[PDB]
Design a protein around this ligand. Structure first.
Ligand SMILES: [Mg+2]
Ligand SMILES: [Mg+2]
Ligand SMILES: [Mg+2]
Ligand SMILES: [Mg+2]
Ligand SMILES: [Mg+2]
Ligand SMILES: [Mg+2]
Length: 81
RNA sequence: GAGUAGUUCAGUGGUAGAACACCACCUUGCCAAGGUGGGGGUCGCGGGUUCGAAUCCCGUCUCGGGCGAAAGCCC
RNA sequence: GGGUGCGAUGAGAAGAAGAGUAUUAAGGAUUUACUAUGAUUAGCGACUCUAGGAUAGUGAAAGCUAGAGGAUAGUAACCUUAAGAAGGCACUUCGAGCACCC
């Protein structure tokens, strides 16, 4: 769902920043890219589900980057609405 | 002429030097830098000369080049 | 503006380390190791001693190997005092630029 990502009010970018966004429950929707290494994805989606927050996985992470406006690509993006 | 420490170069008859690299400690999450120490070389290989050969001689191996009809020879 | 490289699998900055460590002095201790050097005189060549080596010549004493032990300095290693730094990854906040080139 890049409609939700390329828009939205507040969005944090990067697995660490999404984990820090989860660590204070200020995030409303969590987006995670599929073709990323699951070793890192696991830790953020687990904490996400544990918090009880919705997770919307997306196909491409380069596309995630492009939707965020970033030029390098992201693994996880948190929408801190 | 080219072949010498792991690499790169010195060493022009006295058992192989420097630099860098490597190991150990300093030392620690981890490396770099650094400071002490340390280990390492059929000197292409084999005979001879000599008390002693990386050095001289002979045979021989590989590479680059020169001479020669070639064998050889020279660098 | 152009050509690359890296970058949310974290650019970059600060912090935290590194650390009271390196380094700089004054003493202290005077045992360790390392380095340099060893009168005259022959000899290319000498810190001394033992054991093998090998040994032509020179010398009171030879070059190798293995030990052990020495003076003269120069160093590091250990205490006390006063000062006292430094790069990167990783870590911790901020989170997107940084680097080489013309
Ligand atoms: Mg011819
Ligand atoms: Mg021929
Ligand atoms: Mg950084
Ligand atoms: Mg820093
Ligand atoms: Mg401290
Ligand atoms: Mg120009």
């Amino acid at each position: 769902s890049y409609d939700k990502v390329s828009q939205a009010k507040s969005i944090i970018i990067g697995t660490k920043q999404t984990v820090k966004a989860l660590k204070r429950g200020s995030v409303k929707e969590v987006v995670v890219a599929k073709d990323a290494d699951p070793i890192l994805t696991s830790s953020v989606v687990s904490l996400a589900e544990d918090q009880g927050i919705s997770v919307s996985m997306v196909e491409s992470m380069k596309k995630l980057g492009k939707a965020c406006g970033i030029e390098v690509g992201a693994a996880a993006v948190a929408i801190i609405l």
